[PDB]
Amino acid sequence: AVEISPDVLVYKSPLTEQSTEYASISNNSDQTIAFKVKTTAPKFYCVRPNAAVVAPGETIQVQVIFLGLTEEPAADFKCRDKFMVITLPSPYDLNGKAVADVWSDLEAEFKQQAISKKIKVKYLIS
């Protein structure tokens, strides 16, 4: 019962300026989870946080900051950028380490338990 949304991040207005849309991870289970957000276009989006733990009953909001294209908005363009949210059980105390520190161990131990979600991106004039 991990919920990840939305299906599509929609950036509007001047695509020549920075803009922020939001994703969300809610842990409705009884067990702490960890998530990680992968970006196919890291030169254009800043993600924060890109990895974190979510306690039972907690919702974490993820900032997806579009850095903009001070260039050409383009007429009749289809954005192909995508984000992949991967969520895993996080049953161990991190011992002060960051989630990024332990992620590879978590994914190696709990790959079968993963709950993944591919978030698409859309540009909207105007």
Swiss-Prot record:
Signal peptide: none annotated. One of its GO terms (cellular component) is nuclear envelope. Keywords: Acetylation, Endoplasmic reticulum, Membrane, Nucleus, Phosphoprotein, Transmembrane, Transmembrane helix. Acts as an endoplasmic reticulum (ER) membrane anchor for cytoplasmic proteins via binding to the FFAT motif of targeted proteins. Regulates phospholipid biosynthesis by modulating the subcellular localization of the transcriptional repressor OPI1. Also contributes to the tethering of the ER to the plasma membrane. Present with 3497 molecules/cell in log phase SD medium. Belongs to the VAMP-associated protein (VAP) (TC 9.B.17) family. The MSP domain is required for binding to the FFAT motif of target proteins. This is Vesicle-associated membrane protein-associated protein SCS2. The chain holds residues 3 to 128 of 244 of the full protein.
